[PDB]
Ligand binder design. Sequence first.
Ligand SMILES: *[C@@H]1O[C@H](CO)[C@@H](O[C@@H]2O[C@H](CO)[C@@H](O)[C@H](O)[C@H]2NC(C)=O)[C@H](O[C@@H]2O[C@@H](C)[C@@H](O)[C@@H](O)[C@@H]2O)[C@H]1NC(C)=O
Ligand SMILES: *[C@@H]1O[C@H](CO)[C@@H](O[C@@H]2O[C@H](CO)[C@@H](O)[C@H](O)[C@H]2NC(C)=O)[C@H](O[C@@H]2O[C@@H](C)[C@@H](O)[C@@H](O)[C@@H]2O)[C@H]1NC(C)=O
Ligand SMILES: *[C@@H]1O[C@H](CO)[C@@H](O[C@@H]2O[C@H](CO)[C@@H](O)[C@H](O)[C@H]2NC(C)=O)[C@H](O[C@@H]2O[C@@H](C)[C@@H](O)[C@@H](O)[C@@H]2O)[C@H]1NC(C)=O
Ligand SMILES: *[C@@H]1O[C@H](CO)[C@@H](O[C@@H]2O[C@H](CO)[C@@H](O)[C@H](O)[C@H]2NC(C)=O)[C@H](O[C@@H]2O[C@@H](C)[C@@H](O)[C@@H](O)[C@@H]2O)[C@H]1NC(C)=O
Ligand SMILES: *[C@@H]1O[C@H](CO)[C@@H](O[C@@H]2O[C@H](CO)[C@@H](O)[C@H](O)[C@H]2NC(C)=O)[C@H](O[C@@H]2O[C@@H](C)[C@@H](O)[C@@H](O)[C@@H]2O)[C@H]1NC(C)=O
Ligand SMILES: *[C@@H]1O[C@H](CO)[C@@H](O)[C@H](O[C@@H]2O[C@@H](C)[C@@H](O)[C@@H](O)[C@@H]2O)[C@H]1NC(C)=O
Ligand SMILES: *[C@@H]1O[C@H](CO)[C@@H](O)[C@H](O[C@@H]2O[C@@H](C)[C@@H](O)[C@@H](O)[C@@H]2O)[C@H]1NC(C)=O
Ligand SMILES: *[C@@H]1O[C@H](CO)[C@@H](O)[C@H](O)[C@H]1NC(C)=O
Ligand SMILES: *[C@@H]1O[C@H](CO)[C@@H](O)[C@H](O)[C@H]1NC(C)=O
Ligand SMILES: *[C@@H]1O[C@H](CO)[C@@H](O)[C@H](O)[C@H]1NC(C)=O
Ligand SMILES: *[C@@H]1O[C@H](CO)[C@@H](O)[C@H](O)[C@H]1NC(C)=O
Ligand SMILES: *[C@@H]1O[C@H](CO)[C@@H](O)[C@H](O)[C@H]1NC(C)=O
Ligand SMILES: *[C@@H]1O[C@H](CO)[C@@H](O)[C@H](O)[C@H]1NC(C)=O
Ligand SMILES: *[C@@H]1O[C@H](CO)[C@@H](O)[C@H](O)[C@H]1NC(C)=O
Ligand SMILES: [Fe+3]
Ligand SMILES: [Fe+3]
Ligand SMILES: [Fe+3]
Ligand SMILES: [Fe+3]
Ligand code: NA
Ligand code: NA
Ligand code: NA
Ligand SMILES: [Zn+2]
Ligand SMILES: [Zn+2]
Ligand SMILES: [Zn+2]
Ligand SMILES: [Zn+2]
Lengths: 424, 425, 424, 423
Amino acid sequence: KNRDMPLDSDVFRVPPGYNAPQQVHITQGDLVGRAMIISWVTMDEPGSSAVRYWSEKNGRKRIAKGKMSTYRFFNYSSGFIHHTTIRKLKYNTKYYYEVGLRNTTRRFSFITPPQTGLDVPYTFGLIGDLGQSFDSNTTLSHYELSPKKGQTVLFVGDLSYADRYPNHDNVRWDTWGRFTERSVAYQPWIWTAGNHEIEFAPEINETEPFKPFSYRYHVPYEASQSTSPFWYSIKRASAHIIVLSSYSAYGRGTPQYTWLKKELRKVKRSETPWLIVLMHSPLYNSYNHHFMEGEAMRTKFEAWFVKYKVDVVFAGHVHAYERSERVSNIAYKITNGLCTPVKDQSAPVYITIGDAGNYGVIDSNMIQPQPEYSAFREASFGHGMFDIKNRTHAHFSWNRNQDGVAVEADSVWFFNRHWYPVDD
Amino acid sequence: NRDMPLDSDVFRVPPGYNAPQQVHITQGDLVGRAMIISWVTMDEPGSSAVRYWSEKNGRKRIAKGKMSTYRFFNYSSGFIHHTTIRKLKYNTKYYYEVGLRNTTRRFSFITPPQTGLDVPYTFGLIGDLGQSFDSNTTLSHYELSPKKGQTVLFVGDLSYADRYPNHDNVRWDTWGRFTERSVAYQPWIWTAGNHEIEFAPEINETEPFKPFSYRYHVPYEASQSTSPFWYSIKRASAHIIVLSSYSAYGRGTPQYTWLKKELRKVKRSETPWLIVLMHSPLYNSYNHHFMEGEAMRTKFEAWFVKYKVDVVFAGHVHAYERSERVSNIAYKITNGLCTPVKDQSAPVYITIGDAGNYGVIDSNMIQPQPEYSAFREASFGHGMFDIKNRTHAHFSWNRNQDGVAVEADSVWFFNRHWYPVDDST
Amino acid sequence: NRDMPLDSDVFRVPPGYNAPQQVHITQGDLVGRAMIISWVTMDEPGSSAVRYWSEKNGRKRIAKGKMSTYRFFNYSSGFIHHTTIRKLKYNTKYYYEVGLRNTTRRFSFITPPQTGLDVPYTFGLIGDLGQSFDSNTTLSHYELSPKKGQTVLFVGDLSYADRYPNHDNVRWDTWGRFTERSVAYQPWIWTAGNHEIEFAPEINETEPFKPFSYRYHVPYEASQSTSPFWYSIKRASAHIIVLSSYSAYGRGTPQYTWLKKELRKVKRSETPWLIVLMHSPLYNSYNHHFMEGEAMRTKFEAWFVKYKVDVVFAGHVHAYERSERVSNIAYKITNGLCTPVKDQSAPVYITIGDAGNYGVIDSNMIQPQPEYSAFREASFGHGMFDIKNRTHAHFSWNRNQDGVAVEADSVWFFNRHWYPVDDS
Amino acid sequence: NRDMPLDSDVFRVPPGYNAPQQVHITQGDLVGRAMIISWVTMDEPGSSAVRYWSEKNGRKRIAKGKMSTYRFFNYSSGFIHHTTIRKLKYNTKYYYEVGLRNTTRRFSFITPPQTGLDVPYTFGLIGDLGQSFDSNTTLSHYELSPKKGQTVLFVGDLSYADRYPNHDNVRWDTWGRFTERSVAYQPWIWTAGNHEIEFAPEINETEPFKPFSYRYHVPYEASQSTSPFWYSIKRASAHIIVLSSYSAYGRGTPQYTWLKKELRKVKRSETPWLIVLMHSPLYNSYNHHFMEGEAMRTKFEAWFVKYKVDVVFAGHVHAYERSERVSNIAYKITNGLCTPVKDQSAPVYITIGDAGNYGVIDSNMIQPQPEYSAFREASFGHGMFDIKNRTHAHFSWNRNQDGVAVEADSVWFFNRHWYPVDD
Ligand SMILES: *[C@@H]1O[C@H](CO)[C@@H](O[C@@H]2O[C@H](CO)[C@@H](O)[C@H](O)[C@H]2NC(C)=O)[C@H](O[C@@H]2O[C@@H](C)[C@@H](O)[C@@H](O)[C@@H]2O)[C@H]1NC(C)=O
Ligand SMILES: *[C@@H]1O[C@H](CO)[C@@H](O[C@@H]2O[C@H](CO)[C@@H](O)[C@H](O)[C@H]2NC(C)=O)[C@H](O[C@@H]2O[C@@H](C)[C@@H](O)[C@@H](O)[C@@H]2O)[C@H]1NC(C)=O
Ligand SMILES: *[C@@H]1O[C@H](CO)[C@@H](O[C@@H]2O[C@H](CO)[C@@H](O)[C@H](O)[C@H]2NC(C)=O)[C@H](O[C@@H]2O[C@@H](C)[C@@H](O)[C@@H](O)[C@@H]2O)[C@H]1NC(C)=O
Ligand SMILES: *[C@@H]1O[C@H](CO)[C@@H](O[C@@H]2O[C@H](CO)[C@@H](O)[C@H](O)[C@H]2NC(C)=O)[C@H](O[C@@H]2O[C@@H](C)[C@@H](O)[C@@H](O)[C@@H]2O)[C@H]1NC(C)=O
Ligand SMILES: *[C@@H]1O[C@H](CO)[C@@H](O[C@@H]2O[C@H](CO)[C@@H](O)[C@H](O)[C@H]2NC(C)=O)[C@H](O[C@@H]2O[C@@H](C)[C@@H](O)[C@@H](O)[C@@H]2O)[C@H]1NC(C)=O
Ligand SMILES: *[C@@H]1O[C@H](CO)[C@@H](O)[C@H](O[C@@H]2O[C@@H](C)[C@@H](O)[C@@H](O)[C@@H]2O)[C@H]1NC(C)=O
Ligand SMILES: *[C@@H]1O[C@H](CO)[C@@H](O)[C@H](O[C@@H]2O[C@@H](C)[C@@H](O)[C@@H](O)[C@@H]2O)[C@H]1NC(C)=O
Ligand SMILES: *[C@@H]1O[C@H](CO)[C@@H](O)[C@H](O)[C@H]1NC(C)=O
Ligand SMILES: *[C@@H]1O[C@H](CO)[C@@H](O)[C@H](O)[C@H]1NC(C)=O
Ligand SMILES: *[C@@H]1O[C@H](CO)[C@@H](O)[C@H](O)[C@H]1NC(C)=O
Ligand SMILES: *[C@@H]1O[C@H](CO)[C@@H](O)[C@H](O)[C@H]1NC(C)=O
Ligand SMILES: *[C@@H]1O[C@H](CO)[C@@H](O)[C@H](O)[C@H]1NC(C)=O
Ligand SMILES: *[C@@H]1O[C@H](CO)[C@@H](O)[C@H](O)[C@H]1NC(C)=O
Ligand SMILES: *[C@@H]1O[C@H](CO)[C@@H](O)[C@H](O)[C@H]1NC(C)=O
Ligand SMILES: [Fe+3]
Ligand SMILES: [Fe+3]
Ligand SMILES: [Fe+3]
Ligand SMILES: [Fe+3]
Ligand code: NA
Ligand code: NA
Ligand code: NA
Ligand SMILES: [Zn+2]
Ligand SMILES: [Zn+2]
Ligand SMILES: [Zn+2]
Ligand SMILES: [Zn+2]
């Protein structure tokens, strides 16, 4: 009945040694990819926030200094959380970095992306609603073993699922930290905030939304002049990635709404032709679980996505896989009867990819019959891959946990909305 | 530029060293036995103590409150006092004094009757007031009304200070001195509008609602809300729910969670009249801000129908509108059911955002008038929601161009719980 | 090391889920009508509500206080509760309950009589207590005394946790559980000693007095002090001034300014007995900490004489000493007058820092005994300051090696204001 | 009274929208390679950036700092900028600009030589300046000294704003505009005095040193202090220790702990001139504040003799005094030894708090002159401590009533480490 991996699972083991860094993770730390946020936890004493790093070829060893913090949540006290931004990195260079410089040093590595550009290829993993059940471990293995070979994960929210435990037992953030480390210590994960990150629990006097998640997973939101960690953009290779918060305000005149309207004007499709939006709650979703929860955001932002010709919108939240047709539903005017989606070659494809495991439960009840806006849907565990070839073509595939690591149960060519708007 | 100039009589500084100014009150508890007393001192911090006594008991007590200050760009505020008087007697006239240390000023208010089934009560409805000459006329029409408003339900957009350069917060101070002649003597129930957001990254002011939330306090914890921007009060026979159009309301957010559990706590056997206040109207056939209320409608409209809300008041559109009782809660993306229909279980939606703002009326309407809209007109004015008993409340809309006793629109509400009968005009 | 082990009986954890522990009370206002109720819960934050009733009227009432936490290096505190009960009736037994949500525990205390000229009261005097076995024997002698102390005047150095590695704040927890059998039932008046400073920059803990000040609250605002470390209370016929040896006391500083105004507020027609507490002694003829009190003496000794202070109690030296009435205030740099003289307007200075500490007595004394020193001895013990009326107070010192009713030293105090007879 | 009126020329507000005012600099690191740049903008927040370049390179760089504000009773401050420029070159003139967003103003300073055994350097000594007409005359005399002061060691009591009703902090702003003509072009080294405490509970202002600590930053973490009110710096051949008379200094306290460790780091072969600054004098034979320094003297006087401090500079007494080299550290309560004695290991104690304050001089003296006092006079003026090399430093005192080149008192300091002969 509980498919969550027990506490003594191998994926949760504590790196040995006095004050050994654990829960190590990295993410892009600037707007174009010359910087990296390095994050980790030490449990025995505060320790140093210094990060030692060097490129595998030059080898001059540099130190970066960051910041230490802690938080409480009901009767849980966190370890000592470190966040340190390494900057001015060279493009397309393998770096080594070390954490724990005062006591037990641990060494990792990452490869910086190429410089942003029109035809730069890059491979993104899509993972949503991961959790720490056995299905979660299989998904992460299927991603690590992908022959497509993913270089950055776009994570569309719902991370540890710790809020399911009594009092949100934040020990389950620590176990998730150690479990995902074997991926996100070596390549950036791009964080979207889901509903399991809100952790609004007034009954135990914890009413600050996103508190544990926000303390543990930093994002470079200032780099795109956002005033909140929960919405932001980054550019990587030939992609411009916009990260939105389903569970923050997006009313007209609110900060998120203001930021996004202004951020879409800065997109340059001749520098980054692939325009990608991440959000947690899907705007198009023909499952019963969470059906039409995305309507509110859709009324605010769908016309914008069409007007600026977003290529693809990735969401999670529904524990299943779905791929829409290119449609829009933006002609409604209350009394004009125009409330059915139509094909629209200026509209993104919406993909739901919230099926990486969560706590062991798949969403299988679909609306019937399958609506026209729904191109493909299936209730199986898996992950996605968005493989950009060049300015016109990107190949998307869905890998199921029950198939071999090189089998795509679904696959579609994306034809760029700016450089190549062919029907797909 | 129809805003009143700085040396207008309504803006005068009360005389005397450190005379309290911008005095205002609002309900300070869930049921009406408390008042939050608020004012500003400009010359020095002064005391936060409030001396108060009832006309009959005569015993003079002291309440102690708190002082705060804020900055916004290159404006620094004076000294803001918030003091809550508690454990008052119902239906009792009280005097209170502020500015104990140097220049004292005396005012009065009348606590509401105890909450009960047939308790009559007359609520003013004012939205988008601003500080134009139109604003002053409306306030004059409200205070001279023959129906005698006892509480103002204020549906957002207060000072419009954010239209001035750097949101020149002096225009918050002027508005507090203007409105004082009403809100020092009777509560105003505050809803946050978009002019209260004051999100201004270009001058490093990124904290939404900061001036408003410093100047106007609400009893939000009394309904176990975690934020000033949504909360609930009961007063006489009304249960009043105040929502924030410019806060989060997705599933699982604080305001969504609070609202869902707040609706369950409404007892129509105790407070018959269920009133919702918000700034952006769910139903609005004017072109200005057309369909901006759609996002909140998708989350909450079915909840309003399920709980048989009597009336939803909003502002934002600078005009007046009264809807039919309608719902639009059957849409399923592909089924074509996106037209509102008559629904006796649904509230009446009233836009009342025509109190004056900076002097501009919203006249462009969508033609012809849709079936869902009962009455609309692009004129300045205000409203009165006059509860008679558990079955009947009389709503009336008064225009600034008419005399203060003339109702250009008028409807008898049949209470959705105790008199669930078609009340359309 | 003579510190009692962690498994000692005195350190037992009260049973039951989130049972309040480390329960301590102190006077909560200026005149004795309020009490600060303090305790720690370990399993979860719990309620800060205190339920209380007098013996006389038996009406249960609720007072609500505040919860707080702190960190010190790699230690995290439990949940600390401070709640003030007010409007208590004079000379009256109260019962109070803490832990209202899970495991409740009930205690009692007796308010002092109203302040007046001739109101009798017995103050205990305990200094540099620690948690050695010697500390336990002192505490036992106090609670078994036939003199029956009604309040402890505590002259500083509490737990000595700062002697443990990283000041192991677990040893504050043990001390609170150990002292509870006394301070849960009668107020202790806190003075801050040097072991409470805990200035440890080498582990980035630089806020002076931080652990002490979170765990032990004083009614400092009731005498218009701006700092917990100096303040005044009145109780029965006593006006008690508590001073901070390790805060600033230069001319113009907060402590200096507060003390100058506060001596002018003493009304000996209401509280005849004027008592000053401080950690470091102004008159001390032992070698350990010899002359460390000179700095405060230069600043405050002439004030104590001018305001006819009856007695100054201090700790810091791990032994007992009682001075004659002397002053050393005629010094003008070049006039040679630096010898203390008998001055029947001066206080008696008493060192009483011998309650046990970590098991070490200070036995090195300057020989021969100076004329200013009336009696001194290197033995563990405590004091009793037993007020009879406005003229007469009996002070006695009890040694840990004697019977609980044996006074190894005693002296009648004749009040400096109401009865200035030679009491040599 | 005798304070200069608000419309005086020294108080004039620099013109242009949001033009920086109250510009002041101080040393920014331990050894002299850094400078803290400080200033106020009144019209809006503005930029905290400082553009700077050397006269030699001309490569203009930018350093970014921080903006802060404070209230005090019914006063609200302007926007206070502190920005630290680092990696400066030794012995080099730099220009710097503040006010980059609207009205830019330009200044300059000259970095000190690198620290060394025989490095000459000329220090000014000012205490208790205030803003009376007397204060302006002392500043003029300092600016016009033929010895050319390169840094001011300032021993406390700055604006005397706390004498006005509610400490009227406008009188901090004016003092900032008045002193700028000096402290914008050379560091002043800041010591906290009693008029900086501003403990005013009757108007609910209880944070000690608040207005001063907002407006004047020091490089206290460079010497591993945890408080701005005590710290050290090295400059040329001087090691300078700044103490806080009005902070705690009992055994085990932060300032006590810091001073005992700091004295162990002193290297007389790198900086042979060991200098202590404090506000309250440990030696003082005037009736005003007589013996107020006794408490700090019980704690620190033996450390000064032990480490052979050359000179201790203090203010607070509104006059001038130069002690003999004496110590008074033998007292043991009953041994009777409480008279100071000639001590060639001891520093000279100079009271130099006569720079003007609000117009009033302290003229009552203990009579007769004690053996431990060498020279004392109740006149307005300032001091100069002129280091020639590791053995010789010339101290001069200049009175406001004399010519700017006249030294009414002067003495040769022989270094206690390198040349401890009777002076
Ligand atoms: C806080 O830091 C202390 C200093 O490192 C910890 O004590 C050290 O723990 C080591 C185990 O990792 C042990 O080898 C060292 O001997 C010991 N050092 C000293 C000076 O005692 C302390 O760890 C606690 O105590 C030890 C004995 C273990 O039992 C730990 O499990 C304890 O938690 C640290 N405490 C905490 C709460 O992190
Ligand atoms: C962008 O990448 C696409 C995927 O690799 C290219 O399409 C592929 O081009 C191959 C030629 O190298 C061809 O065999 C494959 O069939 C084809 N794949 C698909 C799904 O069409 C694309 O190549 C250009 O466009 C195609 C349609 C042909 O015209 C080629 O001759 C072109 O080089 C790449 N486009 C660009 C601009 O590089
Ligand atoms: C509740 O308030 C209603 C509005 O004031 C009352 O109806 C009004 O009753 C008046 C006489 O009491 C009558 O002149 C008004 O025309 C009438 N107003 C309307 C809009 O109908 C109502 O009184 C009951 O209902 C009316 C229709 C009559 O039948 C009365 O005799 C009834 O008592 C009030 N209800 C009660 C129980 O008083
Ligand atoms: C204040 O307390 C003193 C200590 O108890 C009283 O002195 C004691 O009085 C007894 C008779 O009440 C007598 O037997 C004891 O010997 C005496 N103790 C001492 C140490 O002197 C004192 O009583 C007054 O003073 C004494 C000296 C006698 O004159 C008594 O007759 C007096 O009443 C108490 N003061 C008052 C005013 O009661
Ligand atoms: C350090 O500076 C001192 C002051 O300038 C030097 O003393 C001065 O030396 C001059 C020529 O050497 C001589 O004309 C001056 O009268 C004399 N000033 C004084 C106040 O004595 C000092 O020179 C050395 O020291 C003195 C004592 C003599 O022995 C000279 O002959 C020495 O050169 C300078 N010391 C050093 C080490 O540079
Ligand atoms: C504000 O109130 C206080 C207390 O009621 C008065 O003392 C003030 O009077 C002024 O301040 C005192 C200190 C004294 O100078 C008096 O003469 C002043 O008039 C009062 N302030 C004013 C401006 O009336
Ligand atoms: C101070 O500098 C800022 C930044 O360069 C300018 O924006 C200000 O210019 C004034 O305000 C702007 C918005 C623009 O309208 C300009 O025309 C104004 O002069 C500048 N302020 C002043 C007073 O020069
Ligand atoms: C998780 O998967 C990894 C990689 O396949 C495997 O080595 C590990 O044993 C698995 N652990 C659990 C608990 O499933
Ligand atoms: C502050 O208060 C004093 C009186 O207490 C008044 O005279 C002065 O002008 C006030 N200053 C400001 C800036 O309000
Ligand atoms: C506002 O209205 C009041 C009463 O109607 C009037 O006395 C006052 O002069 C008006 N002020 C204006 C229009 O500025
Ligand atoms: C402490 O003293 C008490 C009372 O004398 C006794 O019951 C207890 O056993 C003692 N404990 C220790 C550890 O000495
Ligand atoms: C927190 O509280 C729960 C009881 O609700 C308990 O089971 C758990 O062990 C506690 N953990 C900590 C670290 O206090
Ligand atoms: C201050 O002194 C300067 C230089 O001596 C002079 O120019 C100025 O006029 C003086 N100002 C006042 C107010 O004395
Ligand atoms: C604030 O700034 C504006 C220009 O940006 C200026 O005109 C105005 O007078 C300023 N106000 C204050 C109070 O400084
Ligand atoms: Fe999920
Ligand atoms: Fe409006
Ligand atoms: Fe001790
Ligand atoms: Fe002075
Ligand atoms: Na939602
Ligand atoms: Na809106
Ligand atoms: Na001391
Ligand atoms: Zn979800
Ligand atoms: Zn609006
Ligand atoms: Zn001690
Ligand atoms: Zn001084």
